Swiss-Prot record, chain A:
Gene: TNKS2
Cell location: Cytoplasm; Golgi apparatus membrane; Nucleus; Chromosome, Telomere
Residue numbers bearing the (3S)-3-hydroxyasparagine modification: N29, N97
Annotated function: Poly-ADP-ribosyltransferase involved in various processes such as Wnt signaling pathway, telomere length and vesicle trafficking. Acts as an activator of the Wnt signaling pathway by mediating poly-ADP-ribosylation of AXIN1 and AXIN2, 2 key components of the beta-catenin destruction complex: poly-ADP-ribosylated target proteins are recognized by RNF146, which mediates their ubiquitination and subsequent degradation. Also mediates poly-ADP-ribosylation of BLZF1 and CASC3, followed by recruitment of RNF146 and subsequent ubiquitination.
Lineage: Eukaryota, Metazoa, Chordata, Craniata, Vertebrata
Assembly: Oligomerizes and associates with TNKS. Interacts with the cytoplasmic domain of LNPEP/Otase in SLC2A4/GLUT4-vesicles. Binds to the N-terminus of Grb14 and TRF1 with its ankyrin repeat region. Interacts with HIF1AN. Interacts with RNF146; this interaction leads to ubiquitination and proteasomal degradation. Interacts with NUMA1.
Region annotated HIF1AN-binding, chain positions: 56-64
Modified residues ((3S)-3-hydroxyhistidine): H64
Tissue specificity: Highly expressed in placenta, skeletal muscle, liver, brain, kidney, heart, thymus, spinal cord, lung, peripheral blood leukocytes, pancreas, lymph nodes, spleen, prostate, testis, ovary, small intestine, colon, mammary gland, breast and breast carcinoma, and in common-type meningioma. Highly expressed in fetal liver, heart and brain.
Recorded family membership: Belongs to the ARTD/PARP family.
Description of post-translational modifications: Ubiquitinated at 'Lys-48' and 'Lys-63' by RNF146 when auto-poly-ADP-ribosylated; this leads to degradation. Deubiquitinated by USP25; leading to stabilization.
Reported effect, H64N: Enhanced hydroxylation by HIF1AN
UniProt-recorded name of the protein: Poly [ADP-ribose] polymerase tankyrase-2
Amino acid sequence: SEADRQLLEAAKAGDVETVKKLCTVQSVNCRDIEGRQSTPLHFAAGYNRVSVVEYLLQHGADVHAKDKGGLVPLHNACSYGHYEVAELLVKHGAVVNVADLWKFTPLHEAAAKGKYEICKLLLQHGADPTKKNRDGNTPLDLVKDGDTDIQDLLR
Amino acid sequence: QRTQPDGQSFRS
């Protein structure tokens, strides 16, 4: 519907005032049907819209909602290096060892994308560096050659 | 096949 479509666009743009205007109990966890079924929190998280992320969480956004590929907003935060966002989600109860349809964890995302401090954050909250995805790869397996500091951290 | 999360690394 149009209202949900606009909410999603606002959460993506970081347009707080429009979020405040369209976020109802009915719509706060709506899903983008045309894409990979992201929720407003997925978008706010993936696009590093901290205020929107805070607002949505405070107004009942589901920190554990999986999209079409089985991603939770923490995946989005971790893959794109949004540290504060990652911290917000974790502090609000996000499961760190959560796994998508391919058994990728946020730690797989953060490791493959070369985000050290995010990897560290995940490890401090008990992320398992030994978890394998569908390809039989640990997050360590996914680390670029240059990122020896991340290899060391995961090891 | 597996595609990227909604989002991007850089706000600019």
